[PDB]
């Protein structure tokens, strides 16, 4: 391409709409605000969620629950994802991270049973679903926490 023949990708660009520039635009004068009231004013309009004095939804409804200070959450790996390692592989958290199956380890690696395992592996993880452990064993492999 040449600097005197530049062309943006079709549909990538659109000219911004300018209000208050005459009647033919269709946004002259009141500039799309209609006539009068709070919403016609510079800076006007109520808080999002305000309902004009009707008790708002998030005050008529009640609060629920608490957050556990010691909450644990595990990086999850399913069997279908384990299917990428060569049979006989020793799958470990380090290998999962390096291979890019797991990005953030969180509180540790849990193996879950979605999909089908098609390889024999020795899997080391912090936790296993009952189904995940059963599938790993049934494919001839082994698992350890």
């Amino acid at each position: 391409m040449k600097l005197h023949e530049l062309k943006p990708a079709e549909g990538s660009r659109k000219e911004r709409n300018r209000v208050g520039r005459g009647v033919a635009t269709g946004n002259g004068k009141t500039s799309g605000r209609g006539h009068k009231g709070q919403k016609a004013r510079s800076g006007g309009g109520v808080r999002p969620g305000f309902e004009g004095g009707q008790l708002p939804l998030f005050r008529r409804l009640p609060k629920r629950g608490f957050t556990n200070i010691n909450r644990k959450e595990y990086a999850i790996v399913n069997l279908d994802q384990l299917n990428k390692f060569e049979d006989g592989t020793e799958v470990t958290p380090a290998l999962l991270v390096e291979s890019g199956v797991v990005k953030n380890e969180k509180s540790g690696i849990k193996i879950l049973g979605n999909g089908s395992l098609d390889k024999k592996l020795t899997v080391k993880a912090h936790k296993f679903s009952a189904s995940a452990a059963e599938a790993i064993d049934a494919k001839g492999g082994a698992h350890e926490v």
């Binding site: 999002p48 309902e51 939804l57 005050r59 409804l61 009640p62 629920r64």
Partner: protein, 64 residues
């Protein structure tokens, strides 16, 4: 600057897999002698934030 979460709403909802907002139920605080057994039993069950309310409040929970 960053937009601020509405903390009361955040204390009152949870986002579901499809992006909806699970909510608890009004009329579940007191005066249970004035509501029928069936009323209270069914008020025990959570609902979702309605579509019409979502139009109004969705930005309050953008980070939720």
């Amino acid at each position: 600057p960053k937009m601020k979460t509405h903390r009361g709403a955040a204390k009152r909802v949870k986002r579901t897999a499809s992006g909806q907002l699970k909510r608890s139920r009004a009329f579940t605080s007191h005066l249970f002698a004035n509501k029928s057994t069936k009323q209270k039993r069914q008020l025990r069950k959570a609902r979702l934030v309605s579509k019409s309310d979502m139009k109004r409040v969705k930005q309050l929970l953008a980070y939720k």
